[PDB]
Design a protein around this motif. Structure first.
Motif, PDB file in Angstrom:
ATOM      1  N   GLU D 114      21.617   4.611  56.386  1.00 23.12           N
ATOM      2  CA  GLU D 114      21.646   3.712  55.241  1.00 23.12           C
ATOM      3  C   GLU D 114      20.357   2.916  55.207  1.00 23.12           C
ATOM      4  O   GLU D 114      19.672   2.851  54.195  1.00 23.12           O
ATOM      5  N   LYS D 117      15.630   4.745  54.447  1.00 24.79           N
ATOM      6  CA  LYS D 117      15.878   5.584  53.300  1.00 24.79           C
ATOM      7  C   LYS D 117      15.007   6.808  53.389  1.00 24.79           C
ATOM      8  O   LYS D 117      15.483   7.930  53.350  1.00 24.79           O
ATOM      9  N   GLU D 120      12.536   9.174  49.008  1.00 23.77           N
ATOM     10  CA  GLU D 120      13.186   9.450  47.733  1.00 23.77           C
ATOM     11  C   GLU D 120      12.182   9.792  46.598  1.00 23.77           C
ATOM     12  O   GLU D 120      12.418  10.707  45.818  1.00 23.77           O
TER      13      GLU D 120
END
Ligand SMILES: [Mg+2]
Ligand SMILES: [Mg+2]
Ligand SMILES: [Mg+2]
Ligand SMILES: [Mg+2]
Ligand SMILES: [Mg+2]
Ligand SMILES: [Mg+2]
Ligand SMILES: [Mg+2]
Ligand SMILES: [Mg+2]
Ligand SMILES: [Mg+2]
Ligand SMILES: [Mg+2]
Ligand SMILES: [Mg+2]
Ligand SMILES: [Mg+2]
Ligand SMILES: [Mg+2]
Ligand SMILES: [Mg+2]
Ligand SMILES: [Mg+2]
Ligand SMILES: [Mg+2]
Ligand SMILES: [Mg+2]
Ligand SMILES: [Mg+2]
Ligand SMILES: [Mg+2]
Ligand SMILES: [Mg+2]
Ligand SMILES: [Mg+2]
Ligand SMILES: [Mg+2]
Ligand SMILES: [Mg+2]
Ligand SMILES: [Mg+2]
Ligand SMILES: [Mg+2]
Ligand SMILES: [Mg+2]
Ligand SMILES: [Mg+2]
Ligand SMILES: [Mg+2]
Ligand SMILES: [Mg+2]
Ligand SMILES: [Mg+2]
Ligand SMILES: [Mg+2]
Ligand SMILES: [Mg+2]
Ligand SMILES: [Mg+2]
Ligand SMILES: [Mg+2]
Ligand SMILES: [Mg+2]
Ligand SMILES: [Mg+2]
Ligand SMILES: [Mg+2]
Ligand SMILES: [Mg+2]
Ligand SMILES: [Mg+2]
Ligand SMILES: [Mg+2]
Ligand SMILES: [Mg+2]
Ligand SMILES: [Mg+2]
Lengths: 159, 169, 58, 294, 121, 213
Positions: D114, D117, D120
């Motif tokens: 979590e 990250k 992305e």
RNA sequence: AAGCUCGUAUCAGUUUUAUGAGGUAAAGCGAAUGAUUAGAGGUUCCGGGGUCGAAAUGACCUUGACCUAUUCUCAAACUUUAAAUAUGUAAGAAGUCCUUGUUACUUAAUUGAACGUGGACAUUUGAAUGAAGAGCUUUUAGUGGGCCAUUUUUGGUAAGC
RNA sequence: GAGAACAGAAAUCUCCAGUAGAACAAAAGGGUAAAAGCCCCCUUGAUUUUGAUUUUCAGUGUGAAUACAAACCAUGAAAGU
RNA sequence: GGUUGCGGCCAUAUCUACCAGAAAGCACCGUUUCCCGUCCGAUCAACUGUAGUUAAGCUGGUAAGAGCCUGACCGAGUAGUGUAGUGGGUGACCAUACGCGAAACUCAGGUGCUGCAAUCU
């Protein structure tokens, strides 16, 4: 002139074992050393760095320090009429955990275990090692064992 | 049996052992270039030999490796010169073979008097498929016995195609 | 003139009159040549673990 | 081959480590990956093990014990179907892909997934995954090439980029990524980005089909059979990260038959070896065949 | 045993008997009390020193020897080394510093030690 | 030249053979070590007799030679160039030294030059071996006996229970040969193992596993 | 010599148990290296001297070198193996276990690492035997030509060398 | 070892066998094979600060060496070195 | 049980020869636009898993097989050796007493074991 270099007289001390030359196996690098560990010193002449001086070959001592690639070891050494304290910076390749201490720890674990299962019975323990004793009386039988009787042998050249 | 293992020319290496440095050797190389389409490699003397007149680490000789359909074509041109006959020599025990020609103009090739005339060695090495086993980095290995090239085998090869003659023994 | 050159004769007799002993021994032994950072941090783990005990007396 | 090995030779011959003979382990390079600063005691060095077979891509995270190497988590390219990659199962884009999956997957099971990250965003730029101040430190892992050549643009450094961007800390540098121009001594992140999404592959498809209806139709037979348009390739890979970071968890295969079941057939093709008793019986017969001068 | 071995050319030893022990402890028994070699002439002395391990007599001392048993160590150590004379009768051999097996003295002469001790007692 | 054997009869020094550190020793006075019918098959001479040292000393080369001749010769005149095999079973590998004094130098720098060779020879150690036909026992014993007188120390003479230079009691030898387990060779002989590869074990000793007799 | 701090302790020119180090003795050489006797078979289709048609880019030859399996014998400065005697360490309170405190070191991580709090465990509390007490400081004399014996051993023919 | 025009005992070009029989400045000994040897690429840790240690030792000096600490760097994808 | 990846111990694993290998895997193998390396896309790099093959690699089985391992009252309680003697012997050297004790040799058995993760009639 005489010659007393650092590695003198160590032709056979630092040789490798027959058919055991080359890379030192990975086990050696995976053993972990804490302070108060009792290590055996035995040089490996392929790892030239962190080498024990030939004196300490065959000597056991205790780790006083742990570093990136080597342990520091305390050796008691007699000079003249007295032992002196000796601090060795040895790379791990030349060092080994001392099995005799592991016999000891394992025995201490045994002796706490025996001691429990006795207080859990309030009975007596008898924990100290006894040394090998005499022998008690026996009765060997002759059933299938009538003593073959022997006699000394004549002289005789075989050449 | 006979499926894979079809037996083929691994590589062809042409050598010109010139034996001296300078223009003569630049010229000999150019031939090898003007022929292989490749850029060739010079060899240095392993050691000084005085009766031959060569010094250690002198550039003496040049060779080029050719593989694939070209080397199969430059092999023929040579074979053409040796009138499609070789000797039961030439064929090494391990399966490779070779020969040599005088005068390179005898296989194609214009003259060009600024280049002169060189002769040359022709060693062709033979393998089968599955030879990368001996050549690769990881898990290098040795061919199996009932595989791998020999002189009985790659002589009969040489006769079958090329419709050739191997002489003497 | 020439004289004897060397010998260890009598030397262990001499060494063993009042000698050998053992090596002297202590809990909390010398920290000579131990990894300086670790000593530095040990310094701090001690001050702290001290402190915290005096806090437990009020 | 009449180069026979003199019994002398054999006797004082000293065999290499088993996995040296096999040409699998580079023990010189192993010793340096595996060895810990002894004052970190049982702090395990963790290895990013990346190997390529001819049809698959292996990505394990390994640590070493004296009794054996142990794996924390493993991911493959042949998992990638589940995550939408059906073809090109050993190309660069599957390498990045497999490098991502292992990342997410390990540090999912670890618990730091979590936090950390990753990227992305993915414009294929050079950056490590620095740790969040006032918090944990990232799962650090060191790449294990094994026997692969260090060429700039190598498949194995895909899985690296895959894993870094996955939010593993994996120390590296640019100069072995596609995009690294050694004149320039700079990286063009466009090229590296492209590669993550199989750029170099897709293009060739377009160049091929136009120039060679026949070759293309052979090399790419299966993009036809599934109507994978070429310039849709990127969206396969992009979409595949989605589903990967989505459910990184490992699910096994559904295995017909039980272990024993397999076994009790799966090599009663094993050749069973004689008893010395029978062996002697063979010895004593072989002679009568050979006895008598011929 | 490995001690005896080491020392065998200088000593002469064997397996004692209640007889020999009885008479050794009676006639030549001295106890160790704050160094001092004190003769066991009254049972109180043993009990004042060996009582804690049982043993409040001289035959309590003897028993604990011949049977070995639990506090043999502390019993036997209590016993000052016995000062025997030279053998009245003689060593029974020309030279003593060979082994009993070779023609006399030194080494384990087993249950012959009694005849020896008794003449030195 | 040459000081008496008495100055070098005892094994007083660690072996000092010719070596890269001891180059420049002269040549052993004995060179021939096998003579008589040295090419004779193992079968010819079944009887074996040994000249055995009973001391622990050194034998010079020159002793070995002198004794070798005195052996060979007496054997040949009395039963002939081909009636025996004489093997000198001891080589003069060790180098004797002389300090060698030429006013004068002294005991300074006393390390000696090489002076000649000898053989460090043991209790029981065979010196000479002879093989013949049983009908030459007494001619053989006296060959050796004549030789004794050339060698320092008590050296015994013994009748070997062995078929010639081989091992094996004479009875155990004849088992083997009449079983075909024995094959001739360069004067010696090879034996059939039950160890190697079956094939070339039957191509080496056919006679063993065969019809025959 | 002066004592001082203590007072059964931690001791020991010792054995035992457990576990290390070693390359001498012996051993070995149809095992590596280096030496060394002897044949035997095979090689040369790539050293050779000839006879057979001067012929020989051809045969059978003795002769080297080399190869294969044997054979006799060796090593302070050769060795696979490998003692005996000697030699390191350990056999607990400065220990073992459970709980959870400190820190700037270290870890992906209250993970480790060191050092602690608190709790539990004293009949043999962790082999033998001995202990004539152990520990400790200061200071100063003489001496600083040695020699002998058993054993090991170097130089020398040897020596009361 | 088997093979390639001039090419010969010895030039250069294949292939096969190859535990090190090679190489590593030097004496010898030890050590080493995806290396410590050969070829290539990038380099200045042959640097800065003062401590501890090992050998010879009086446990003085000198020489030489070993392991950390604190800098600044080199190299490598990296661990590392 | 096969197979693969990373291993531990590093020949019971290596050497030689002959076979055998379902399934999956591994492999050989097809290709050269692209990052990239070559005298040579052979190695190295990338691409397809598509055209092919178990021939090879790899795995096992065989062999009075070479080597290597294990044992043994096999040799041998021999060789060597610590301790003892106003023991033998001119000596070289040897026997005995209390102890420790091999190497070769011979014969017999054996020819990888195993951890983590993945996968397979
Ligand atoms: Mg010297
Ligand atoms: Mg030595
Ligand atoms: Mg090796
Ligand atoms: Mg250095
Ligand atoms: Mg020229
Ligand atoms: Mg003077
Ligand atoms: Mg004098
Ligand atoms: Mg003096
Ligand atoms: Mg002087
Ligand atoms: Mg053999
Ligand atoms: Mg590497
Ligand atoms: Mg470009
Ligand atoms: Mg009396
Ligand atoms: Mg009377
Ligand atoms: Mg009287
Ligand atoms: Mg009597
Ligand atoms: Mg005279
Ligand atoms: Mg001498
Ligand atoms: Mg001089
Ligand atoms: Mg001189
Ligand atoms: Mg010897
Ligand atoms: Mg041996
Ligand atoms: Mg030899
Ligand atoms: Mg000497
Ligand atoms: Mg001691
Ligand atoms: Mg006591
Ligand atoms: Mg004084
Ligand atoms: Mg003084
Ligand atoms: Mg003085
Ligand atoms: Mg060089
Ligand atoms: Mg050197
Ligand atoms: Mg070179
Ligand atoms: Mg400098
Ligand atoms: Mg290319
Ligand atoms: Mg290819
Ligand atoms: Mg490739
Ligand atoms: Mg393969
Ligand atoms: Mg075998
Ligand atoms: Mg005496
Ligand atoms: Mg005597
Ligand atoms: Mg006398
Ligand atoms: Mg003896």
């Amino acid at each position: 002139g005489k010659s007393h270099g650092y590695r003198s007289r160590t032709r056979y001390m630092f040789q490798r074992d027959f058919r055991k030359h080359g890379a030192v196996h990975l086990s050696t690098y995976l053993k972990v050393y804490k302070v108060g560990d009792i290590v055996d010193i035995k040089a490996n002449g392929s790892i030239q760095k962190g080498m024990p001086h030939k004196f300490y070959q065959g000597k056991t001592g205790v780790v006083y320090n742990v570093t990136k690639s080597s342990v520091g070891v305390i050796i008691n050494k007699m000079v003249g009429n007295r032992y002196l304290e000796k601090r060795l910076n040895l790379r791990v390749e030349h060092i080994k955990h001392s099995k005799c201490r592991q016999e000891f720890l394992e025995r201490v674990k045994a002796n706490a275990a025996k001691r429990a299962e006795a207080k859990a019975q309030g009975v007596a323990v008898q924990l100290k090692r006894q040394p090998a004793q005499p022998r008690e009386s026996r009765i060997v039988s002759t059933e299938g064992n009538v003593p073959q009787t022997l006699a000394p042998v004549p002289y005789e050249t075989f050449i | 049996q006979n499926p894979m293992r079809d037996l083929k020319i691994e590589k062809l290496v042409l050598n010109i052992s010139v034996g001296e440095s300078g223009d003569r050797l630049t010229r000999a190389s150019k031939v090898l270039e003007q022929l292989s389409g490749q850029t060739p490699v010079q060899s240095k003397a392993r050691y000084t030999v005085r009766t031959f007149g060569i010094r250690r680490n002198e550039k003496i000789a040049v060779h080029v490796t050719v593989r694939g359909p070209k080397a199969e074509e430059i092999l023929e041109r040579g074979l053409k010169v040796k009138e499609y006959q070789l000797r039961d020599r030439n064929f090494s025990a391990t399966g490779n073979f070779g020969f040599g020609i005088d005068e390179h103009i005898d296989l194609g090739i214009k003259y060009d008097p600024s280049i002169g005339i060189f002769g040359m060695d022709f060693y062709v090495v033979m393998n089968r498929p599955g030879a990368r086993v001996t050549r690769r980095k990881r898990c290098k290995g040795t061919v199996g016995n009932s595989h791998k090239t020999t002189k009985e085998d790659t002589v009969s090869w040489f006769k079958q195609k090329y419709d050739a003659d191997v002489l003497d023994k | 003139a020439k004289s004897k050159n060397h010998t260890a004769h009598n030397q262990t007799r001499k060494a063993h009159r009042n000698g050998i002993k053992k090596p002297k021994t202590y809990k909390y032994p010398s920290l000579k040549g131990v990894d300086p950072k670790f000593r530095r941090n040990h310094k701090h783990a001690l001050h702290g673990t001290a402190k915290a005990l005096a806090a437990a007396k009020k | 081959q009449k180069d026979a090995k003199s019994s002398a030779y054999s006797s004082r011959f000293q065999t290499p480590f088993r996995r040296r003979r096999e040409g699998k382990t580079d023990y010189y390079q192993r010793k340096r990956l595996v060895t810990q600063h002894k004052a970190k005691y049982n702090t395990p060095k963790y290895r990013l093990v990346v190997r390529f077979t001819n049809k698959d891509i292996i990505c394990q995270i390994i640590s070493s014990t004296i009794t054996g190497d142990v794996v924390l988590a493993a991911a493959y390219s042949h998992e990638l179907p589940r995550y939408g990659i059906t073809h090109g199962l050993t190309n660069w884009a599957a390498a990045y892909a497999t490098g991502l999956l292992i990342a997410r997957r390990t540090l999912q099971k670890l618990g730091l997934d979590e936090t950390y990250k990753g990227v992305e965003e993915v414009e294929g730029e050079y950056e490590l995954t620095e740790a969040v101040e006032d918090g944990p430190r990232p799962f650090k892992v060191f790449l294990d090439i094994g026997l692969q050549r260090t060429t700039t643009g190598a498949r194995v450094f895909g899985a690296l980029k895959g894993a870094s961007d996955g939010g593993l800390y994996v120390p590296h540098s640019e100069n072995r990524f596609p995009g690294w121009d050694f004149e320039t001594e700079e990286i063009d992140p466009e090229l590296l980005r492209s590669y993550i999404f199989g750029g170099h592959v897709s293009q060739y498809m377009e160049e091929l089909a136009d120039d060679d209806e026949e070759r293309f139709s052979e090399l790419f037979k299966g993009y036809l059979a599934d109507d994978i348009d070429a310039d849709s390739l990127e969206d396969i890979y992009t979409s595949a990260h989605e589903a990967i970071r989505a459910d990184p968890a490992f699910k096994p295969t559904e295995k017909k038959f039980t272990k024993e079941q397999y076994a009790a057939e799966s090599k009663k093709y094993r050749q069973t070896k004689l008893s010395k008793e029978e062996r002697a019986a063979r010895v004593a017969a072989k002679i009568a065949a050979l006895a008598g001068q011929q | 045993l490995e001690l005896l071995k080491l020392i065998e050319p200088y000593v002469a030893y064997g397996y004692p008997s209640y007889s020999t022990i009885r008479q050794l402890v009676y006639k030549r028994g001295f106890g160790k009390i704050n160094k001092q070699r004190v003769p066991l002439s009254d049972n109180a002395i043993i009990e004042a020193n060996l009582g804690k391990y049982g043993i409040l007599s001289i035959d309590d001392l003897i028993h604990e020897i011949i049977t070995v048993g639990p506090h043999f160590k502390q019993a036997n150590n209590f016993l000052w080394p016995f000062k025997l004379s030279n053998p009245s009768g003689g060593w029974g051999v020309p030279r003593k510093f060979k082994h009993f097996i070779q023609g006399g003295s030194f080494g384990n002469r087993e249950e012959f030690i009694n005849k020896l001790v008794k003449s030195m007692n | 030249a040459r000081r008496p054997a008495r100055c070098y009869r005892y094994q007083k020094n660690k072996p000092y053979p010719k070596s890269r550190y001891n180059r420049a020793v002269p040549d052993s006075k004995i060179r021939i070590y096998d003579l008589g019918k040295k090419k004779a098959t193992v079968d010819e001479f079944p009887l074996c007799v040994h000249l055995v040292s009973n001391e622990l000393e050194q034998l010079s080369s020159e002793a070995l030679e002198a004794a070798r001749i005195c052996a060979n010769k007496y054997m040949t005149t009395v039963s002939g160039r081909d009636a025996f095999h004489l093997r000198v079973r001891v080589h003069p590998f060790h180098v004797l030294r002389i300090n060698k004094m030429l006013l004068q130098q002294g005991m300074r720098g006393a390390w000696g030059k090489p002076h000649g060779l000898a053989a460090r020879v043991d209790i029981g150690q065979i010196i000479f071996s002879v093989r013949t036909k049983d009908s030459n026992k007494d001619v053989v014993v006296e060959g050796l006996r004549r030789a004794r007188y050339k060698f320092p120390g008590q050296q015994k003479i013994i009748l070997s229970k062995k078929w010639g230079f081989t091992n094996l009691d004479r009875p155990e030898y004849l088992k083997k040969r009449e079983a075909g387990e024995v094959k001739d060779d360069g004067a010696f002989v090879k034996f059939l193992s039950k160890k190697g590869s079956l094939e070339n074990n039957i191509r080496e000793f056919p006679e063993y596993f065969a019809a025959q007799a």
